[PDB]
Amino acid sequence: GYGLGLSTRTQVTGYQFLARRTAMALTRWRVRMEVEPGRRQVLAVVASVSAAGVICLGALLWS
Amino acid sequence: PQAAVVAIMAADVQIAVVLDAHAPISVMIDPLLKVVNTRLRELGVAPLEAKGRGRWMLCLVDGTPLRPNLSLTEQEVYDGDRLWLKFLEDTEHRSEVIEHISTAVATNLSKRFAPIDPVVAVQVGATMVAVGVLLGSALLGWWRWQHESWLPAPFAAVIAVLVLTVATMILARSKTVPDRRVGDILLLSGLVPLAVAIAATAPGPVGAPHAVLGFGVFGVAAMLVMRFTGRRLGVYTALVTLCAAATAAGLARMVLLTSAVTLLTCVLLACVLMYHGAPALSRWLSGIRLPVFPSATSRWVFEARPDLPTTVVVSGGGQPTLEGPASVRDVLLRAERARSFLTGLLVGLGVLTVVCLAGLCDPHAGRRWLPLLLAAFTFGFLILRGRSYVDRWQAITLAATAVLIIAAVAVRYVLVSGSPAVLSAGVAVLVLLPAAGLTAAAVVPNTIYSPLFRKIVEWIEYLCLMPIFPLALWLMNVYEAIRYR
Amino acid sequence: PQAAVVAIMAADVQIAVVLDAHAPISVMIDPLLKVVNTRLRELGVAPLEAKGRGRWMLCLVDGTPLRPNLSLTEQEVYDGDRLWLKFLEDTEHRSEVIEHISTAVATNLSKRFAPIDPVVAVQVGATMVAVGVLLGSALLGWWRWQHESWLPAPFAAVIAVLVLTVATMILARSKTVPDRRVGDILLLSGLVPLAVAIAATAPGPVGAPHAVLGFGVFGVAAMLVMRFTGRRLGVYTALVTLCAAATAAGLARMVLLTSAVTLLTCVLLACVLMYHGAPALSRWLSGIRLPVFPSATSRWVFEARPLEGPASVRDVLLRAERARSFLTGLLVGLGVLTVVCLAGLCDPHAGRRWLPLLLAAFTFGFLILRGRSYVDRWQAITLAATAVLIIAAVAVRYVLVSGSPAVLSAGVAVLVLLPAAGLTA
Amino acid sequence: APVVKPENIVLPTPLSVPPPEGKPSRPKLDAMRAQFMLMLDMLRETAQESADSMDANYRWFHPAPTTLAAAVGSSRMWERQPDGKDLNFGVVRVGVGMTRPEVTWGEPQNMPTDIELEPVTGKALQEFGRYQSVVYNLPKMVSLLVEPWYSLVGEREQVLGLTRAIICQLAFSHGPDHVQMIVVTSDPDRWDWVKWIPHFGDPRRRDAAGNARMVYTSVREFATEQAELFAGRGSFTTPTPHHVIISDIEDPQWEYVISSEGVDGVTFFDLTGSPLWTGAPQRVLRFTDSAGVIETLPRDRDTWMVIDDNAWFFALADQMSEADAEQFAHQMAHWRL
Amino acid sequence: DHQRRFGHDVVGIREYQGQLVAVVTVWLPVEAVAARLRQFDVRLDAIDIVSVGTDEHHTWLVLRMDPQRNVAAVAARDSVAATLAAATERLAHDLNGRRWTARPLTSSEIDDMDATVLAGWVSPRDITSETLERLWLPDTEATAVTVRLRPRHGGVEVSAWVRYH
């Protein structure tokens, strides 16, 4: 049934897929996903945080 | 011979009789009263008796009498017709003034020229009590701020307790089945004096942790109110967002004694991250749960054909019960709950990001161009983000947030600085930028852009989204700290 | 037994009938239809017919159906009421099921809520540019208040003339839709920078000459846009009321050297006269024969329809609605004047401080008494609201500028107790 | 009359994925999932349009009992002869419930094994098969020509409401020349409203009011011996008037005129469910909920044959009050054709 | 001004920022014609019983209505004239019956009524009932008795006055 247990990669990526599809359904009332901007822009946030960490490591060395 | 069978209405009971279809009314109305009286005595009801002067005479349902010298068939009476047996003072009682009136506008216009219904009076009174208690709590908080004393804290507590008890008694259904509005308005309004009293309980000039505890108790009270009532999800959701941010900022203020600029910047980063997780959180809070996956069950065909919800008619009068589809009806209700939560998140994050960008004080010389550039990037962020939302009030919330960031930074520079150039630039952006928004709203839906240009305008969103984190770290001077510490 | 005379209506015809008050509705609904069909067929009008599947309902004119198993008396229909004889189509149909969570959420929100569209979008743009230019005009006024610079007045003048020309072009070219309110919003927004531009041309330190000039020109421009367009006529009525009072005060401080207290009291006297004068003055203003753009109610009456003939009822409806809008505007403007003058008079650091409190109490009672008089919802609501805000203003002023715990406690007590007393009623 | 068309639609094949194997294409998979989900939605909207067609068909042919006030035009349009109208000549509405649609979901071929089956597409196809295999809130019907009798078991008012709805559906849809009705009761004051209905008129005996009303207070009281020289019935896998005999008398004399086989061309509705009439579980319509949920053995939608031998949800009964039945009866008494 | 409708008879209307319509009637009649002051949706401003003397004797009911108090009722009808025409016909058909006949005034005979009211003086009295019979007694060459019915606080309150010669 349901309860705390163990799960595989294919299950977790499938869950993330359904989460993104529900997010698009909620925000935009469409469910066609030939392109999803949501992934693109959360990856832009990830790039922001990664660049922040990179420049954080860069300024540790010289002065 | 032919006979007609009709239902005589007399003394509020229905009596079926058989009547000659071809004799005149006045011939057969003499034994008919005897038959009706005999039936009434069988039923044990007070028999028909005349008073004054007049005749026994049969009227249709509207009251028009039958012609007494004509048979039933000559007056178009058929089987199963209902006739009222009455004693009338005169033989003439028609009302022949038929009148032409358009029924659509007649049944329409009455409800919107309606006078003041006392349910509206109760709602107005509850609203104005809400405004009054909010003004009282605000004045008590202002007195506690200006005049550090033990006086305002118990008085706000008493008012809060009495208002909440009154509101709960209203919501206790003893006085309110249909208008939860009164109870919700009073309940929401009474929470603010409670938070004011709790904050004023702590010593010091301010409420001792710079009023962490007031915002905290306000937030948790709103969370519990949603947990128990669940009606006004958007409003309490926005208030919970504001209270959560204020409590986090205040706890970092008293624990770490860090600068207010650092606090505003990290709260800004929190809202920036939170705008992207807002659809997910609205899904999660609404109770929408994506289906559990079969881990090891080999069976995949389930012919269980789930049963029917029988929605009993709310009158409870034995009416035929209707049927919804299944348990999955709650997907609808959780769906409007999710929309309400998401609208609340957008409003609250909008307020927080407007407040955080009011941390731009001095003119642009020196390092002050960096937070202004951060404001510009977040403006482009929010104004392009609105494509991702379809419902009008969410899109308006994002657009309004974007333009209010510019409005707030401009008014702060023109008020704090005494430079006429700053004033001219501020009034110039105030008049041009929403005018540009109006022109964009007028032109863009009515013209057909190149897919290339659509890709660039798609990419300004991402390109202004990216550089805001290093600018945030520049404003927090974490880079210089790592340079020196 | 009782019989209730009621007038039923069906198939654009109203017929007066005398229904038995105690027989259930389901008993009478059947022969009543036959009577109505007989009367309509006698008139040559096409009789009522059942289409598809459904049932007949007697309904109140507000729209709710009556209960078939209960008579008129149990469901509180009384003599002289009107009933509506509908044929409700049967709503009973299959229930769609969308098993997938995401698709179900998408279709349920898409079917039930309103998406954003260009019609709303242009109005949002107009609203926000209105807010922006109001902030800009108020900000230039703040700068000219703080500093003696002549240069803000050219900025206010140029932004005013640009927005007014844009509004006029939109009103002329795009008059074809009820989204011409985009032009109205812009023009209402742009009269204010014109007023502050004219006012800032008054030399020397800011004061009454700037005030009298600005409110005078703004009220005059309000009256012209009344006569030229006559669409947003309620809000222009409120604005011209406020400008009339402000211009009277400005001329009273320039032609004379009167104190503020005397002017506030005289304005209050004018307001209490004007609360009596308002319902007749609005019927005078109904006849001003400004150009006829119908508002929402009249528009949505005319969509359902095509001294004699329809021109008469069209004229009557337009006149009545204009009168209603004028009167509402007058009440709102008078409420603002009342609250601002009672705020101005009630200073606690005055030896005669007991008297304006008495005036506040009597006028509070007067407005609440007068609130019972008018039949429209928002008019009575406006009167009750300004009644609450006068005591709110005097309480907040007394607790703000006087640093005493006693007056603080008294104000915060009455400010919660007296609207609660209103809630009890 | 609205038309419904059968279909046959094969379900899409779910995706497959190899499991990983120890140690000592996410976008492609998501695109394939999206394509699968769109195909599934296309099938769902096809199911919706077919279901709406079948809904319109049934509610054309079987209205709600309340809406029978419109008593002309479609009145009495059923025809005796064993073709065409035979598809609905004998059958009457009893409530609302589930039924299988006209689309037949073909079993998807090339199903991957249960370890290779991708979770999301497999679960979504599971749910599609579960929920789109029935149509919800459609009229549930009972054929008078397939059973010797039906029995109603439940509280008194529920059973009476269902019986009034049954009587009214027969009276509206079938003419007096094809269906005649009898009521045998111990409580005659609850059946006084049926005197208006033409189908209760006995043509042989005439009185002042017209044809004699066929309501009897006891089974012994029967002067309709003409309807009792028939044989035991052959079920209909048409006799000139089919007789419907309501009974709530609770009399041990029934089994004399009622064998185990019933009577040809007559159907009985045993109100007050008794051990005499409940001797066959497929003929028992048992009230379970207070709201009026009926449970009985499921039957085939096309042939009315019994599917399985355990009781299951059948319909939410159409309970119709005495006031509404009397209103219809007054309306119905106007007509003579 | 004249009006015709679905109804039976032509009704004369006079208008001067408000409508005036008279109903003639032809002893003691019921005092409760004020029940028809408040019809189903129309709200008449006043009902004046007018009777004049001299030998001739004439009696009229004159109707006053303001459309601005009746915008909801007028907006559903085909014209503002057809509203008060309908109310006039209702009151006329209500009175028409036992002994007294009633009919709405033609527009020319409205001015005839005005002329016969003019024909070329005492105070109002407050306690009204049963004094009307003794009020008609004193000698005159002409006399005009009139009683006004008005809606008041949801009810009907009555006032009257008379002039002689």
Numbering used by the authors:
A (entry chain B): 12 to 74
B (entry chain D): 18 to 502
C (entry chain X): 18 to 323, 339 to 457
D (entry chain C): 13 to 36, 96 to 308, 318 to 417
E (entry chain E): 95 to 120, 140 to 167, 194 to 259, 288 to 332
Original authors' sentences:
We therefore generated two new maps imposing C6 symmetry for modeling these regions: a global map with a 3.4-Å resolution and a locally refined map of the cytosolic part of the protomeric units at 3.0-Å resolution. Because of the observed sixfold symmetry of the TM and cytosolic segments of the ESX-5 complex, we first defined its overall arrangement as consisting of six identical protomeric subcomplexes. Within each protomeric unit, EccD5 was observed to assume an elliptical ring-shaped dimer composed of 22 (11 per EccD5 monomer) TM helices (TMHs) forming the core of the protomer. We observed that one of the EccD5 molecules is proximal and the second one is distal to the central pore, and we annotated them as EccD5-1 and EccD5-2, respectively. We noted that the EccD5 ring-like arrangement is further supported by interactions at the cytoplasmic face formed by TMH6 and the elongated TMH7, connected by an extended loop. Because of the approximate twofold symmetry of each EccD5 dimer, TMH11 of EccD5-2 was found most distal, and TMH11 of EccD5-1 is the closest to the central pore. Both TMH11 helices displayed a distinct diagonal orientation with respect to the remaining EccD TMHs and the pore axis (see below). In our model, contacts between TMH11 from EccD5-1 and the only EccB5 TMH establish a scaffold for the central pore. Besides these interactions at the interface between the membrane and the cytoplasm (membrane cytoplasm inset), we observed several specific electrostatic interactions of the EccC5 stalk domain with the N-terminal EccB5 helix, situated parallel to the membrane. In our structure, the DUF domain was the most distal rigid component at the cytosolic face of the ESX-5 complex.
The ESX-5 type VII secretion system is a membrane-spanning protein complex key to the virulence of mycobacterial pathogens. Key to their pathogenicity is the secretion of a wide range of virulence proteins via type VII secretion systems (T7SSs). The ESX-5 T7SS is found almost exclusively in slow growing, pathogenic mycobacteria and plays a key role in nutrient uptake and immune modulation during an infection. The importance of ESX-5 and other ESX secretion systems (ESX-1 to ESX-4) for the virulence of mycobacterial pathogens makes these membrane-spanning machineries a key target for the development of novel therapeutics.
